[PDB]
Amino acid sequence: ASPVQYLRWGDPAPIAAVVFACLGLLATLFVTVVFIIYRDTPVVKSSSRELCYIILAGICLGYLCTFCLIAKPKQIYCYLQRIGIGLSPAMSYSALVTKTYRAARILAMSKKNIFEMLRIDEGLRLKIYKDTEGYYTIGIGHLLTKSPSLNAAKSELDKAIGRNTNGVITKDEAEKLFNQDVDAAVRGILRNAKLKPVYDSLDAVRRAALINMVFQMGETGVAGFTNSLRMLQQKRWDEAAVNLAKSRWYNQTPNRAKRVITTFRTGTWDAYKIMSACAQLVIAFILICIQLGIIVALFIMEPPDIMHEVYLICNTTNLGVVAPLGYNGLLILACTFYAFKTRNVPANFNEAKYIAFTMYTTCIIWLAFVPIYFGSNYKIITMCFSVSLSATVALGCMFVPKVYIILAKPERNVR
Ligand SMILES: CCCCCCCC/C=C\CCCCCCCC(=O)O
Numbered sequence: 001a002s003p004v005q006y007l008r009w010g011d012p013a014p015i016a017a018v019v020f021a022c023l024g025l026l027a028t029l030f031v032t033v034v035f036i037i038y039r040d041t042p043v044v045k046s047s048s049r050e051l052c053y054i055i056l057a058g059i060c061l062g063y064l065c066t067f068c069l070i071a072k073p074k075q076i077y078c079y080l081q082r083i084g085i086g087l088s089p090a091m092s093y094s095a096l097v098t099k100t101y102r103a104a105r106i107l108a109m110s111k112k113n114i115f116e117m118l119r120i121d122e123g124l125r126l127k128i129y130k131d132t133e134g135y136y137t138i139g140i141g142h143l144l145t146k147s148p149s150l151n152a153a154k155s156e157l158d159k160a161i162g163r164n165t166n167g168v169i170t171k172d173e174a175e176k177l178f179n180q181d182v183d184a185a186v187r188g189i190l191r192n193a194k195l196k197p198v199y200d201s202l203d204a205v206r207r208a209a210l211i212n213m214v215f216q217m218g219e220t221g222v223a224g225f226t227n228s229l230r231m232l233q234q235k236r237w238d239e240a241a242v243n244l245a246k247s248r249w250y251n252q253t254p255n256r257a258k259r260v261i262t263t264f265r266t267g268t269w270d271a272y273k274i275m276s277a278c279a280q281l282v283i284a285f286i287l288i289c290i291q292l293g294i295i296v297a298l299f300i301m302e303p304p305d306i307m308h309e310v311y312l313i314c315n316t317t318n319l320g321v322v323a324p325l326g327y328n329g330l331l332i333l334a335c336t337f338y339a340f341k342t343r344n345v346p347a348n349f350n351e352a353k354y355i356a357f358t359m360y361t362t363c364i365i366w367l368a369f370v371p372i373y374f375g376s377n378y379k380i381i382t383m384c385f386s387v388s389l390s391a392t393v394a395l396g397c398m399f400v401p402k403v404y405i406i407l408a409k410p411e412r413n414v415r
């Protein structure tokens, strides 16, 4: 009848879900108006604002589902229940997986440049060899094993590549091996206090130049260029260029040092030799249309109907929940994969950090939703609270920090 009547009767649940949904709707409208009024601010215009609007619409639909699950005895409401509870997480996570996939592609294309730089400078061997220390190595100085068995080296190489290599790889396989080495080198940099301040206060190209220097001499040797590192930190490229040209490393390996110094100076890859926007909308549209087609197919197979109360009970069985839940869970898994592969990306004021934390919480909440909902005797209220909680964790972990930066730190809103 009425949630207030159920509160007066002794059930403090329907009116609570209504208040939750109303607060969520008000918060979604607040965040949307903030992001529209401040569309040209660098914090908003740096991400996919259209995909952000798609995610906001998903959150709003997830909150509106409570008014469908707690409504009057009507048929269109039994339809809109399934539509909303299937499309809200779909609408959010399709845009989210598009964003995370584009971020992962950007990261791969960024590492490709360092691979090309150190292929030009250091070199590469597609067959297994031994380093000067006498240990099995292949590619751009990638250690296979410290053990003295060529068969063990080939075993670890096959285990790392995933194919019967027989001691021979390709350039892309060598790039895959080189990505782990550059990750380890960056970790070694961020742990030394004589290299981390410069590394964090640089752009990508100069970070790559410093990585090349570390690959050539080591972190302890690169830490010797104290004055030049401080010049680079203070964005004094023209002076650091000369001070590096005065070095003994420049006189021992001049050809590579010239390119590294020119890279440090100009900030471009000119010294060496080396995803659309409307496409993301269409991809998210297709991913949402797949879920909508699932929903329509279940409408045709199992037509909605009132079973037969403030709860509009419908004939929604378990399959009509399992299939959309399954597709949304696959979306969540892909989202989590691509957001974990990009967890340390600092773009958009470290947006991927909050994205990854939100994806972790969503995975946990859904893994808990399965046995809680399916082993429950109050399924409508649990569905209400679960959808509202997922929308809430999304809106709070992803959009609340941005609105906080906009409406409280207007000076940090700079590229
Ligand atoms: C920071 C701003 C405040 C945020 C918290 C707002 C809290 C709102 C909570 C619910 C309001 C009261 C619910 C209405 C009770 C209905 C019972 C009746 O009217 O008879």
Ligand SMILES: CCCCCCCC/C=C\CCCCCCCC(=O)O
Residues within 6 Å of the ligand: 025, 028, 029, 032, 036, 053, 054, 056, 057, 058, 060
């Ligand atoms: C009446 C339902 C609740 C209305 C409050 C929520 C309003 C925002 C809803 C979803 C955000 C995405 C929809 C609009 C996108 C931005 C509009 C635009 O840029 O033209």
Ligand SMILES: CCCCCCCC/C=C\CCCCCCCC(=O)O
Residues within 6 Å of the ligand: 001, 002, 003, 015, 018, 019, 022, 023, 070, 071, 072, 073, 309, 310, 311
């Ligand atoms: C501050 C935000 C919350 C303010 C209090 C809002 C709670 C009371 C509002 C009305 C709830 C009506 C919900 C509609 C469901 C009843 C329809 C039905 O049961 O058939």
Ligand SMILES: CCCCCCCC/C=C\CCCCCCCC(=O)O
Residues within 6 Å of the ligand: 054, 079, 083, 087, 091, 285, 288, 292, 296, 299, 300
């Ligand atoms: C970007 C995603 C936009 C999604 C917004 C909401 C989606 C609503 C889409 C159309 C609903 C049509 C459902 C079919 C009607 C019932 C008839 C039937 O299936 O037999």
